[PDB]
Amino acid sequence: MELGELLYNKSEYIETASGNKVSRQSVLCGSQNIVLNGKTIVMNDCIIRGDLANVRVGRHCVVKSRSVIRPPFKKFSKGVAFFPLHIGDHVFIEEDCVVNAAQIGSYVHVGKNCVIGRRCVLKDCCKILDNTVLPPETVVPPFTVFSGCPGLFSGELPECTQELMIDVTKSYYQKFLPL
Amino acid sequence: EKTAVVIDLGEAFTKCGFAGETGPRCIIPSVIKKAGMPKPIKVVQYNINTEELYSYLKEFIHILYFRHLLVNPRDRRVVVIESVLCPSHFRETLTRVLFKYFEVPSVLLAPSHLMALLTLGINSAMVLDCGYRESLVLPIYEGIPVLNCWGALPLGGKALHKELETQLLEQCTVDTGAAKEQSLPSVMGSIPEGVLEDIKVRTCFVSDLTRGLKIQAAKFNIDGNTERPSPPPNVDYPLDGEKILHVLGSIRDSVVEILFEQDNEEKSVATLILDSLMQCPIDTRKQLAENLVIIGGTSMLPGFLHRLLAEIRYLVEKPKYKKTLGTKTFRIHTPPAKANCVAWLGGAIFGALQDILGSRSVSKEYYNQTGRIPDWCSL
Amino acid sequence: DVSRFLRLYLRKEGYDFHSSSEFEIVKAIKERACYLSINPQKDETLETEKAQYYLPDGSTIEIGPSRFRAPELLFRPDLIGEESEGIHEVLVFAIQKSDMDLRRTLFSNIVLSGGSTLFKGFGDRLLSEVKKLAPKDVKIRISAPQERLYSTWIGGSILASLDTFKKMWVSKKEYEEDGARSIHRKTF
Amino acid sequence: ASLLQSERVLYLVQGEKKVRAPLSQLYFCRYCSELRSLECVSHEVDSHYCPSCLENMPSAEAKLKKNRCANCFDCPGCMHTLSTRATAYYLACGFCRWTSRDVGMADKSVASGGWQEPDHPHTQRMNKLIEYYQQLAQKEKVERDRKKLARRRNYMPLAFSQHTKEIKIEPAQAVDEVEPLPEDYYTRPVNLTEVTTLQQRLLQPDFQPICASQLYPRHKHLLIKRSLRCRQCEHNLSKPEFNPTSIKFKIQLVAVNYIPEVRIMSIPNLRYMKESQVLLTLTNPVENLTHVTLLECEEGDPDDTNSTAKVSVPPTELVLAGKDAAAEYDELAEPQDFPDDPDVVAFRKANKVGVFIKVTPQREEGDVTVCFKLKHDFKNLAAPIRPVEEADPGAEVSWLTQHVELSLGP
Amino acid sequence: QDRVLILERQGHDKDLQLHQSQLELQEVRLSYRQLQXXXXXXXXXXXX
Amino acid sequence: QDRVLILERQGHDKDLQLHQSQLELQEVRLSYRQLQXXXXXXXXXXXX
Ligand SMILES: Nc1ncnc2c1ncn2[C@@H]1O[C@H](COP(=O)(O)OP(=O)(O)O)[C@@H](O)[C@H]1O
Ligand SMILES: Nc1ncnc2c1ncn2[C@@H]1O[C@H](COP(=O)(O)OP(=O)(O)O)[C@@H](O)[C@H]1O
Ligand SMILES: [Zn+2]
Ligand SMILES: [Zn+2]
Ligand SMILES: [Zn+2]
């Protein structure tokens, strides 16, 4: 709201360990294969399944409530297996959002309730708008905005994304405290 | 020298590409998606303030020169195709945008009708331009446009889109998907122009003269009991997903008739050729009649060229045109590119001529000095 | 033709008058606001006021440069592309075609008639355009009446009143007996 | 950028055209002293690339290939990048289940090399017309040159010497009767799936087909890498030669990376009166600033103004430390403690200072808008200096006034 | 004399090219100084 | 013609200047490309 990030008070129940905060409400079925190296946030009722995964997330990663990050299955003639996805640094997944994406780049703002397709690659410094469908096996270049049910080039982003996005994710993390 | 770019700014669609090519590289709706506005504003709009028009054209030309075409604007020349009697302030603005902001080397303001003639190769021909706003005709005799014997009527895309909207609202039968299996009239107050255009293209067609003449008298109901031909089957068209509009068979073949209807005045798209040709010089009559050209996307409508050429030969026998244009052989030219992209193709053929282009075209150095674009009005 | 050419220039200003009814209001626009500039080239370079005209519906239209460069086509019909002499030319040519002795008296007595002389600054332009074509140091008097539009009728009204008119006209019985020529031969 | 509403508080540009834009979008010009907008600055073309298979193509190859990738294809039905599937290869879409088999294109033995677009039907007639007009234009050039050098000479067409292969195109034959509309169209159900919409018709302009079976898939459109160059200044910013899979700038320049960015941290009540807290972070390592000015009286386009923001505060010296600092590491005396300013200054963290503005809302009905001028000490470094060799006191002394327009939520 | 005028025009066009190249030299040379700084930064960052 | 001869000699000298300037620009561009290759190596290290 007018550049400034607003207050969000968390409850007592949340798994805070080595900077990484993960809501107890949010199930993450397969805790072994999933890994959170940095000071990540995972909001309540969110899913990070371990269906033969290697879900590596960023330094300041944010996943809002009711949102799912599942790896896609690669339809290979040699052997059909689930491809391990790698969420980049400073990644912001918005609320109620579906992600079946392989290799999500750093410094990205994925919009609200937007379905990303199977085996979908996202390069760094991009932005997917809200109520948008990226089809299976699609690529989005840097400094781009993809939107619509087709999921196609809408326009370009501001030049200063790399520097700006840092402030957003770090401010949200700092502003997001217990009550 | 570099291959000069060709742009053709229209109300419905803009043609864009490079000179010495078989057709245009990009053809897109002439609109811009501004932040806040739900429906995108139209880039060409006649009779508005210059500053507001300048901003829209600046926004549009930017999209053409970077997103659609990929080339530096300052490097290579421009060939701006625009119809004769295009509003003064609009053409003045369009040039001022290209010369000031983009800093183009030189613009050439070619009339669409003379460009359409080059594509065929014939030096003299009659040219009808059934566009979005107005269906204009202009006789071209051996390179010289005859402005004396001009002709225009508002029987294009806009007039056809409006006629379709009116007819659909009368016989309105939509299946919303909320106990609306039964015929529900006018659930939506207005239908968006994007939908109406898609219905027109896919569903509606141009009827034969014999069947059309019956349709005219049928809807009139001039002291006759159900004297209409059997219509085509009713086509169901989806509106915004769930809502399914059942388009009546009568609407498909009646909507077009407003173009070819006489309406007492004796002013149709057909009559406009013969009205112009009768006003032409006596020596030029037989050459122009033999060489007819039908450009514009409105004439793409299926079975338009057959109805027009037939309606011509019927209106010839009518006593007004029977004396002068009685024993004349009307033959249509088939241009190499499609009816929509005839105008553009001429500018590309002209753009390929680097030697003549530089001389005829207005240089930026001249415009910066003078600030006076040459027109067919007095200097 | 001036009304027809004004409609074309009004479309070049961006106001269409396609309908036959809408042609009548172009004739009204012409009759209301259209001034003949003494020098046409100077008024074109000068920025116009764009004088607003009110239509029957109530809508306003800014005419601008179309106002003055429409009736110019009388004095210079080659501009649009009509092969004619021009209003200044036909007057001079008609005098020059006549015998040399009368030329001076015919220049000294010119009368403007009809409605297409009532254009604002018509007499001013014609005088200037005639002078340069006509011989040097010749007196040119263009005597316009106040009732130019109704001049042709008033002439007939006077002619009709005279007792000489009784002889001039052709009787109904004369037309039945004499034949078709009767009307033509008595004309003069 | 979008999550936080950067499209609210805007900075003004100086020149011919005045524009209100977010600082995120604007660029600072270092050659001179005047920030300019994406609109004001001139655009260039650097490199072309495919959005699917990120391959940097040269400018020459693009002109030959008509600004398209040979390997990648976009579907005609919906607008999405196609994928090669095997059984011996067919082209299929993920969003819609349109195949290359549907339209009736035969499967190729080789993956990429086999696929092609048919030649344009009126390509042979085209070249013949160009060559005819080229020869005919060349005659006019010689005539115009001969006429011009005769005028330049001014010899009155003096005959010193004796004065004074042809290409003839056949003009297209006019058909007596054009083909009528087929009698099928009368008394036949029209399937809207079979016939194509305008959008997908017009994407293939060379021979836009009514039927779907004719409509072939066009090559994927190449995208552009923009480089900005100003009117007064020369260079400004640009991009690398490997913009594909890179977020690095060859020359990073932006208004947020020089001019101190203002943000509305707290928003108070909108009912006729309130006290709004706004932050003023610095980007430069060591500098000084001040938000003293009240935007004069009816000067610098204050038409948007619908309130009277006092901001009656003297300059406050803030500095940025490009390092990972702890929560209250050290307390500096002269910077922080000396100008305590409890009423004026809300809080002073690292590269951060909150300031209370006394706004007067409900002067109009709604949509509260405030105009205020912000000053800053711009270390321009216009003169030649290697790692701040020159003192740059006159540069630092220069006070640059940016007319800011903050828009409260209302 | 036509050859003289044409050769003068050729020299003038070459001088225009030279001036454009000089403007590009200045602008892209400030760019190259920035890139030199960037290359130093890149070596340091490679170490880091 | 003698004046034009002086102009033509100066034009040839300026063409030599153009050759030198273009050579310097191309060489600096090649050096920057090598630096960018080094940067790409650094980026590979960073990816690792
Ligand atoms: N391929 C087509 N088939 C049928 N109708 C078309 C086609 N292309 C365009 N049209 C219709 O005809 C019109 C043509 O307008 P156009 O000539 O492109 O614009 P302008 O006259 O402004 O230059 C469009 O508005 C559309 O309604
Ligand atoms: N006040 C006026 N100013 C300008 N033009 C006028 C004016 N009054 C009439 N006209 C023009 O002159 C025409 C009238 O011609 P008129 O004198 O009636 O011809 P006639 O002599 O054949 O009866 C009008 O139709 C109009 O075009
Ligand atoms: Zn500058
Ligand atoms: Zn590709
Ligand atoms: Zn598709």
Author numbering:
A (entry chain V): 1 to 179
B (entry chain J): 12 to 390
C (entry chain I): 189 to 376
D (entry chain Y): 2 to 88, 106 to 182, 219 to 464
E (entry chain x), F (entry chain X): 290 to 337
Provide text from the study.
We performed signal subtraction on the TDR and TDH datasets individually to focus on the pointed end, which slightly improved the density around the cargo adaptor interaction sites compared with previous maps (Urnavicius et al, 2018). The majority of pointed end interactions cluster around four sites. Site 1 involves the disordered loop following the long helix in p62. It is shared by all three adaptors, with the loop appearing to adopt different conformations to bind each adaptor. BICDR1 contacts sites 2 and 4. In our TDR structure, we previously estimated the registry of the BICDR1 coiled coil using density for the sole tryptophan (Trp166) (Urnavicius et al, 2018). This positions a series of negatively charged glutamates near the first half of the loop in p62, suggesting an interaction between the cargo adaptor and site 1 at this point. Extending our registry suggests that the positively charged site 1 loop on the pointed end binds to a negatively charged patch on BICDR1. Further along the adaptor, our model positions the BICDR1 Spindly box near a prominent kink in the adaptor (Urnavicius et al, 2018) and close to site 4 on p25.
